[PDB]
Coordinates of N, CA and C in Angstrom, one line a residue:
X1 N 36.4 19.6 69.6 CA 35.4 18.6 69.1 C 36.1 17.3 68.5
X2 N 35.9 17.2 67.2 CA 36.5 16.1 66.5 C 36.0 14.7 67.0
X3 N 35.8 13.8 66.1 CA 35.3 12.5 66.5 C 36.5 11.5 66.6
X4 N 37.0 11.1 65.5 CA 38.1 10.2 65.4 C 38.7 10.1 64.0
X5 N 39.6 11.0 63.8 CA 40.3 11.1 62.5 C 41.7 10.4 62.5
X6 N 42.3 10.4 61.4 CA 43.7 9.8 61.3 C 44.5 10.6 60.3
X7 N 45.8 10.6 60.7 CA 46.8 11.3 59.8 C 47.8 10.3 59.2
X8 N 47.7 10.2 57.9 CA 48.6 9.3 57.2 C 49.8 10.0 56.6
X9 N 51.0 9.6 57.0 CA 52.2 10.3 56.5 C 53.1 9.2 55.9
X10 N 53.7 9.5 54.7 CA 54.6 8.5 54.1 C 56.0 9.1 54.1
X11 N 56.9 8.3 54.6 CA 58.3 8.6 54.8 C 59.2 7.8 53.8
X12 N 60.1 8.5 53.1 CA 61.0 7.8 52.2 C 62.3 7.4 52.9
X13 N 62.4 6.0 53.0 CA 63.5 5.4 53.7 C 64.7 5.5 52.7
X14 N 65.9 5.8 53.3 CA 66.0 6.1 54.8 C 67.4 5.9 55.3
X15 N 67.4 5.1 56.4 CA 68.7 4.8 57.0 C 68.8 3.3 57.3
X16 N 68.3 2.9 58.5 CA 68.3 1.5 58.8 C 67.1 1.1 59.6
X17 N 66.8 1.9 60.7 CA 65.6 1.7 61.5 C 65.4 3.0 62.4
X18 N 65.1 4.1 61.7 CA 64.9 5.4 62.3 C 63.5 5.4 62.9
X19 N 63.3 6.1 64.0 CA 62.1 6.2 64.8 C 61.5 7.6 64.6
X20 N 60.1 7.7 64.6 CA 59.4 8.9 64.5 C 58.7 9.2 65.8
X21 N 58.7 10.5 66.2 CA 58.0 10.9 67.4 C 57.0 12.1 67.0
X22 N 55.7 11.8 67.2 CA 54.7 12.8 67.0 C 53.7 12.9 68.1
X23 N 53.0 14.0 68.1 CA 52.0 14.3 69.2 C 50.8 15.0 68.6
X24 N 49.7 14.9 69.4 CA 48.5 15.6 69.0 C 48.6 17.1 69.3
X25 N 48.0 17.9 68.3 CA 48.1 19.4 68.5 C 48.6 19.7 69.9
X26 N 50.0 19.7 69.9 CA 50.7 20.0 71.2 C 49.9 19.6 72.4
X27 N 49.8 18.3 72.5 CA 49.1 17.7 73.6 C 50.0 16.7 74.4
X28 N 50.0 15.5 74.0 CA 50.9 14.5 74.7 C 51.9 13.9 73.8
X29 N 53.1 13.7 74.3 CA 54.2 13.2 73.5 C 54.3 11.7 73.7
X30 N 53.8 11.0 72.8 CA 53.8 9.5 72.9 C 55.1 9.1 73.5
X31 N 55.1 7.8 73.9 CA 56.4 7.2 74.5 C 57.5 7.3 73.4
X32 N 58.5 8.1 73.8 CA 59.6 8.3 72.9 C 60.5 7.1 73.0
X33 N 61.0 6.6 71.9 CA 60.6 7.2 70.6 C 59.1 6.8 70.3
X34 N 58.4 7.8 69.7 CA 57.0 7.6 69.3 C 56.8 6.1 68.8
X35 N 56.8 6.0 67.5 CA 56.6 4.7 66.8 C 57.6 4.5 65.7
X36 N 57.8 3.3 65.3 CA 58.8 3.0 64.2 C 58.0 3.0 62.9
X37 N 58.4 3.9 62.1 CA 57.8 4.1 60.8 C 57.2 2.7 60.3
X38 N 56.0 2.7 59.9 CA 55.4 1.4 59.4 C 55.5 1.4 57.9
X39 N 56.3 0.4 57.4 CA 56.5 0.3 56.0 C 55.2 0.5 55.3
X40 N 55.3 1.1 54.1 CA 54.2 1.4 53.3 C 53.7 0.2 52.6
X41 N 53.2 0.4 51.4 CA 52.7 -0.8 50.6 C 53.3 -0.7 49.2
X42 N 54.2 0.2 49.0 CA 54.9 0.4 47.7 C 56.1 -0.6 47.6
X43 N 57.2 -0.1 48.1 CA 58.4 -0.9 48.1 C 59.6 -0.1 48.5
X44 N 59.9 -0.2 49.8 CA 61.0 0.6 50.4 C 60.5 1.9 51.0
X45 N 59.2 2.0 51.0 CA 58.6 3.3 51.6 C 58.1 3.0 53.0
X46 N 57.9 4.0 53.7 CA 57.4 4.0 55.1 C 56.1 4.8 55.2
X47 N 55.2 4.4 56.2 CA 54.0 5.1 56.4 C 53.6 4.9 57.8
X48 N 52.9 5.9 58.4 CA 52.4 5.9 59.7 C 51.0 6.6 59.8
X49 N 50.3 6.1 60.8 CA 48.9 6.7 61.0 C 48.7 7.1 62.4
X50 N 48.2 8.3 62.6 CA 48.0 8.8 63.9 C 46.5 9.3 64.0
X51 N 45.8 8.9 65.0 CA 44.5 9.3 65.2 C 44.4 10.6 65.9
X52 N 43.4 11.4 65.6 CA 43.3 12.7 66.2 C 41.8 13.1 66.4
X53 N 41.1 12.2 67.1 CA 39.7 12.4 67.3 C 39.4 13.6 68.1
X54 N 39.9 14.8 67.7 CA 39.7 16.0 68.4 C 40.8 17.0 68.0
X55 N 41.9 16.5 67.5 CA 43.0 17.4 67.0 C 42.9 17.5 65.5
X56 N 43.1 18.8 65.1 CA 43.1 19.1 63.7 C 44.5 19.2 63.1
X57 N 45.5 19.1 64.0 CA 46.9 19.2 63.6 C 47.7 18.4 64.5
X58 N 48.7 17.7 63.9 CA 49.6 16.9 64.7 C 51.1 17.1 64.2
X59 N 52.0 17.1 65.2 CA 53.4 17.3 64.8 C 54.1 16.0 65.0
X60 N 55.1 15.8 64.0 CA 55.9 14.6 64.0 C 57.4 15.0 63.8
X61 N 58.3 14.2 64.4 CA 59.7 14.5 64.3 C 60.4 13.2 63.8
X62 N 61.6 13.3 63.3 CA 62.4 12.2 62.9 C 63.7 12.1 63.6
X63 N 64.0 11.0 64.1 CA 65.3 10.7 64.9 C 65.7 9.3 64.6
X64 N 67.0 9.2 64.3 CA 67.6 7.9 64.1 C 67.6 7.1 65.3
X65 N 67.4 7.7 66.4 CA 67.4 7.1 67.7 C 68.8 7.1 68.4
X66 N 69.6 7.9 67.9 CA 71.0 8.1 68.4 C 71.4 9.5 68.4
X67 N 70.8 10.3 69.2 CA 71.0 11.7 69.4 C 71.1 12.4 68.0
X68 N 70.3 11.7 67.1 CA 70.2 12.2 65.7 C 68.8 12.6 65.4
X69 N 68.5 13.8 65.9 CA 67.1 14.3 65.7 C 67.2 15.2 64.5
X70 N 66.0 15.3 63.8 CA 65.9 16.2 62.7 C 64.6 16.9 62.7
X71 N 64.4 17.8 63.6 CA 63.2 18.6 63.8 C 62.8 19.3 62.4
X72 N 63.3 20.5 62.3 CA 63.0 21.3 61.1 C 63.8 22.6 61.2
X73 N 63.1 23.6 61.6 CA 63.7 25.0 61.7 C 63.4 25.5 63.1
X74 N 62.8 24.7 63.9 CA 62.5 25.1 65.3 C 62.1 23.9 66.2
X75 N 61.0 23.3 65.9 CA 60.6 22.1 66.6 C 60.1 21.0 65.6
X76 N 58.9 21.2 65.1 CA 58.4 20.3 64.2 C 57.3 21.0 63.3
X77 N 56.7 20.2 62.5 CA 55.7 20.8 61.6 C 54.3 20.3 62.0
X78 N 53.2 21.0 61.5 CA 51.9 20.7 61.8 C 51.2 20.0 60.6
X79 N 50.7 18.8 60.8 CA 50.1 18.0 59.8 C 48.6 17.8 60.1
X80 N 47.8 17.8 59.1 CA 46.3 17.5 59.3 C 46.0 16.2 58.6
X81 N 44.7 15.8 59.0 CA 44.3 14.5 58.4 C 44.3 14.5 56.9
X82 N 44.2 13.3 56.4 CA 44.3 13.1 54.9 C 45.6 12.4 54.5
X83 N 46.1 12.8 53.4 CA 47.3 12.2 52.8 C 48.5 13.2 52.9
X84 N 49.6 12.7 53.5 CA 50.8 13.6 53.6 C 52.0 12.8 53.3
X85 N 53.1 13.4 53.0 CA 54.4 12.7 52.7 C 55.5 13.5 53.4
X86 N 56.2 12.7 54.3 CA 57.3 13.3 55.0 C 58.7 13.0 54.4
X87 N 59.4 14.0 54.0 CA 60.7 13.8 53.3 C 61.7 14.7 54.0
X88 N 62.9 14.1 54.4 CA 63.9 14.8 55.0 C 64.8 15.6 54.0
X89 N 64.9 15.0 52.8 CA 65.6 15.7 51.8 C 67.1 15.7 52.1
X90 N 67.9 16.1 51.1 CA 69.3 16.1 51.3 C 69.8 17.5 50.7
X91 N 69.3 17.8 49.5 CA 69.7 19.1 48.9 C 69.4 20.3 49.8
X92 N 68.8 21.3 49.2 CA 68.4 22.5 49.9 C 67.0 22.3 50.5
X93 N 66.7 21.1 50.9 CA 65.4 20.8 51.5 C 65.6 20.3 53.0
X94 N 65.3 21.2 53.9 CA 65.4 20.9 55.3 C 64.1 20.5 55.9
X95 N 63.8 19.2 55.9 CA 62.6 18.7 56.4 C 61.4 19.4 55.7
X96 N 60.7 18.6 54.9 CA 59.6 19.1 54.1 C 58.5 17.9 54.0
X97 N 57.3 18.4 54.0 CA 56.1 17.5 53.9 C 55.3 17.8 52.6
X98 N 55.0 16.8 51.8 CA 54.3 17.0 50.6 C 52.9 16.3 50.8
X99 N 51.8 17.1 50.6 CA 50.5 16.5 50.7 C 50.2 15.8 49.4
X100 N 49.3 14.7 49.6 CA 48.9 13.9 48.5 C 49.6 12.5 48.5
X101 N 48.8 11.5 48.2 CA 49.3 10.1 48.2 C 50.5 10.0 47.3
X102 N 51.6 9.6 47.8 CA 52.8 9.5 47.1 C 52.8 8.2 46.3
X103 N 53.6 8.2 45.2 CA 53.6 7.0 44.3 C 55.0 6.8 43.7
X104 N 55.9 6.2 44.6 CA 57.3 5.9 44.2 C 58.1 7.2 44.5

């Protein structure tokens, strides 16, 4: 079903110009690379919105665009509509997403 929802994910930059690739509940894989993280509204942050007028979960991946992919522990993660935050992490955090509107 689903009408027309959207998934907002905030990514913490970063590198230089990394690209993100996501798709609807295992449906179609947008033109790789998906889309270039859209800067947020904070300062130095990134944000992207994906519609899912039928999908309740969408997967997104992170790649520098140079054979530098950063899936997770298999392929990717499942994200739902609302507010989410994508963080690659450096410490003992291998690809993690935190729900809730981020603030700095």
